[PDB]
């Protein structure tokens, strides 16, 4: 039931314009867990299956077998948006601590942040 940072949920991102990612696709909860408990919104990064490999520091690969996906996919840390929890459909899985470390680093790059 609870929403935790690093969970992967099915979410409806439509509608969108231009090059924004869209439709109903898996997304990763990147919001802090306090928000994920009390806030009406979560912050997510989109997952895409149109590429299984990605040459970009804002991209993170995820294998289909471990994470129960349809096929090997990529987390896009340059496509992030705040969603009302009413958009969150089913819970697919959650990322390992290691994978969440990679997600975190990619996010640090996307937003130009430094430790």
């Amino acid at each position: 039931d609870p929403i935790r940072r690093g969970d992967v949920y099915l979410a409806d991102l439509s509608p969108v314009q231009g090059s924004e990612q869209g439709g109903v696709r898996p997304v990763v909860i990147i919001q802090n867990d306090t928000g994920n408990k009390y806030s009406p919104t979560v912050i997510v990064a989109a997952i895409t299956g149109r590429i299984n490999k990605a040459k970009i520091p804002t991209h993170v690969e995820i294998e289909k077998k471990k994470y129960k996906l349809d096929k090997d996919s990529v987390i896009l840390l340059e496509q992030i948006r705040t969603l009302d929890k009413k958009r969150l459909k089913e819970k697919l899985t959650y990322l390992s601590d290691d994978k969440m470390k990679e997600v975190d680093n990619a996010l640090m790059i996307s937003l130009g942040l430094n430790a």
Partner: nanobody
């Protein structure tokens, strides 16, 4: 829903392995804590571990003597207690920690350290 095991009576300097088995809820969504209670003297929080296992926490009184761990496939938490001393005698509860409060509580297991 949460069943403790592994408690017992040991001599000072001994060790024990407590375990807590979860059912009826999705174990992959909670952080876990161990808290203990000695007779009369109030409840003392002992340890904790995040949902994925990467991050662990301990009270100053048990720090370095105890080791917390999780198996999310078996939906189980463990506490390894070493260098036990009489002051460690207490009942040991597993509990679920979610951001700030507890939700589900185990039934406890007794631990006694005396000659």
């Amino acid at each position: 829903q949460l069943q403790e095991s592994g408690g017992g009576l040991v001599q000072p300097g001994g060790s024990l392995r407590l375990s807590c088995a979860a059912s009826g809820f999705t174990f992959s969504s909670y952080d876990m804590s161990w808290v203990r209670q000695a007779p009369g003297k109030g409840l003392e929080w002992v340890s904790a571990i995040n949902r994925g296992g990467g991050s662990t926490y301990y009270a100053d009184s048990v720090k370095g003597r105890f080791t917390i761990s999780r198996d999310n496939a078996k939906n189980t938490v463990y506490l390894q207690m070493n260098s036990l001393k009489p002051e460690d005698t207490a009942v040991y509860y597993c509990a679920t920690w979610w951001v700030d409060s507890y939700d589900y509580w185990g039934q406890g297991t007794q631990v006694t350290v005396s000659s």
